[PDB]
Amino acid sequence: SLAERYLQQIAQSEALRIQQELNYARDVAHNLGQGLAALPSAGIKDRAVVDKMMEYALRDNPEYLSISVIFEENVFDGRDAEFADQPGQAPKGRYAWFVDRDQAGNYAMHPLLSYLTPGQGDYYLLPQKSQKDTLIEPYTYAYNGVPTLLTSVAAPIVSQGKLWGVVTSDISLASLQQKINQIKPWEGGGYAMLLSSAGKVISYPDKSQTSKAWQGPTDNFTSSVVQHDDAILGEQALVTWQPVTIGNSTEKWYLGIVVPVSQVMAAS
Amino acid sequence: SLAERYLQQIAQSEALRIQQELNYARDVAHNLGQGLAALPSAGIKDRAVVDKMMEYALRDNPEYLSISVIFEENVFDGRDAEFADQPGQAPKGRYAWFVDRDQAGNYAMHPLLSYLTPGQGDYYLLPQKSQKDTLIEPYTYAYNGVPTLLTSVAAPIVSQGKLWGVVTSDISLASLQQKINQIKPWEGGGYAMLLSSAGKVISYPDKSQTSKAWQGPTDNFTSSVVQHDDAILGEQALVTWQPVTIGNSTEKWYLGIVVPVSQVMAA
């Protein structure tokens, strides 16, 4: 049907827009990583140089929560054992650090205490093993004493067959929701929703649903158009899903478009 | 009008896909540039470090022709005078270099001899003046002795108020054409076109129009659908235009979608 193809095409356009936002974040992390891997080749072995490069990347991205960098064991300078148990360092002396902004807006380095533990540390552990770009399931981190729901857009660092580590761009769920809730897919109405790979809510007009498992209408996040009793719109709605993918990832997120049957069938 | 709106939506999706590809190149150049500007701040003043980061950016982008970096005068190391008027260097001893691949496939650094000359050097001169990301009008450079049509995706380096220079990702027009000509906007049929800001043909299914001016019926590059006799399709066709923009560029390219009227009149 012509209406349903048009609806499918709207969903495609909107998934491409949000895909551009997430790829931008992947690119910041991926391109920062390629430059960091060039440093040992050029004879630069000073971890303060990595700190400054990470700082300038965060500086250029004022809405990001932080940038995180994890090199593989010893590959940067060979000195993980010297840092191993010193105060304020990361587990086993690894170059595993992130940069964020303080309450005054100046830039601070903090060690990645979580990077070896399953769950919290998946921003490192999952892409380290797959060597694939990865949109990480939503989780929580306290920045300046404020619990914050976020995702990480993680990019393995691969060059000349060698894994150098992982770089991530750390993105608040709120900032994503700010873009998704602007989407008005049909004559200034309807709404858009965004779901993770595991089907966790990234953005839904009922913010109380954030980070929770979706328990609703999808038939395996189909591209087909399906009619549902929608609680946000309070009427019969048409729903279609489109995938969102970054870099070389094989997994995906799902953008959903929801429009009222009344305004669609009636426009005909 | 529902058919019109769908056609417009198709153009918007195809435009977004091309725009993602051009923005990937903008990002390569922009993000390298931010890393390079960090280096003096960290005490690195060795031009060989810049060489290596450029090489690693090109290595990660085997399809690109080269990556070019032009620093502003003396901003990296203050030593331009020590490199000035030596053969093998760029004009005035500037850090102005590109990296490319040999016929053997290994990486070589070459000076940007043209960075101050109007026309050939616009990849530097135009973004240095506007300080905006810029899709450079298509031009020619002899890589390894072979004239090649390319565009440069140019990203001025700005950090904490200061212009540090310009980085560019240099892309062959052939690779862009190879992507535009796979676009089949309708049922597997029709085609897509790409005009530069100046109306030069970036991509048109007749490649002999490449880089030439477009003396065709564009309606102020309107989203509005317009009907025209089309030579490529050989029938009445519907045309619609959508902008394509990178970074903070104020200028844009235009993707045109062209589909036969007979197949749109179907539904």
Residue numbers in the entry:
A (entry chain A): 18 to 285
B (entry chain B): 18 to 284
Paper quotes:
Chemoeffectors are sensed by chemoreceptors that in turn stimulate chemosensory pathways that modulate the activity of the flagellar motor. A canonical chemoreceptor is composed of an extracytosolic ligand-binding domain (LBD) and a cytosolic region that contains the signaling domain that interacts with other signaling proteins. The dCache domain is the predominant extracellular LBD in bacterial signal transduction systems, and it is present in about 15% of all chemoreceptors. To identify the molecular determinants for acetylcholine recognition, we report high-resolution structures of PctD-LBD (with bound acetylcholine and choline) and PacA-LBD (with bound betaine).
We also identified the PacA (ECA_RS10935) chemoreceptor of the phytopathogen Pectobacterium atrosepticum, which binds choline and betaine but fails to recognize acetylcholine. Betaine bound most tightly (KD = 7.5 μM), followed by l-carnitine and choline with KD values of 20 μM and 113 μM, respectively. Importantly, titration with 5 mM acetylcholine did not produce any change in heat, indicating an absence of binding. We crystalized the PacA-LBD and solved its 3D structure in complex with betaine to a resolution of 1.9 Å. The overall structure is highly similar to that of PctD-LBD, with a root mean square deviation of 1.6 Å for the Cα atoms in a structural alignment. A well-defined electron density was observed for betaine bound to PacA-LBD. The orientation of betaine corresponded to that of acetylcholine in PctD-LBD, which was the opposite of the orientation of choline. The coordination of the quaternary amine moiety in PacA-LBD is very similar to that of PctD-LBD and primarily involves a number of aromatic amino acids. However, the amino acids that coordinate the acetylcholine tail in PctD-LBD (Ala168, Met169, Asp171, and Ser172) are not conserved in PacA-LBD. However, comparison of the three-dimensional structures of ligand-bound PctD-LBD and PacA-LBD identified the amino acids uniquely involved in acetylcholine recognition.
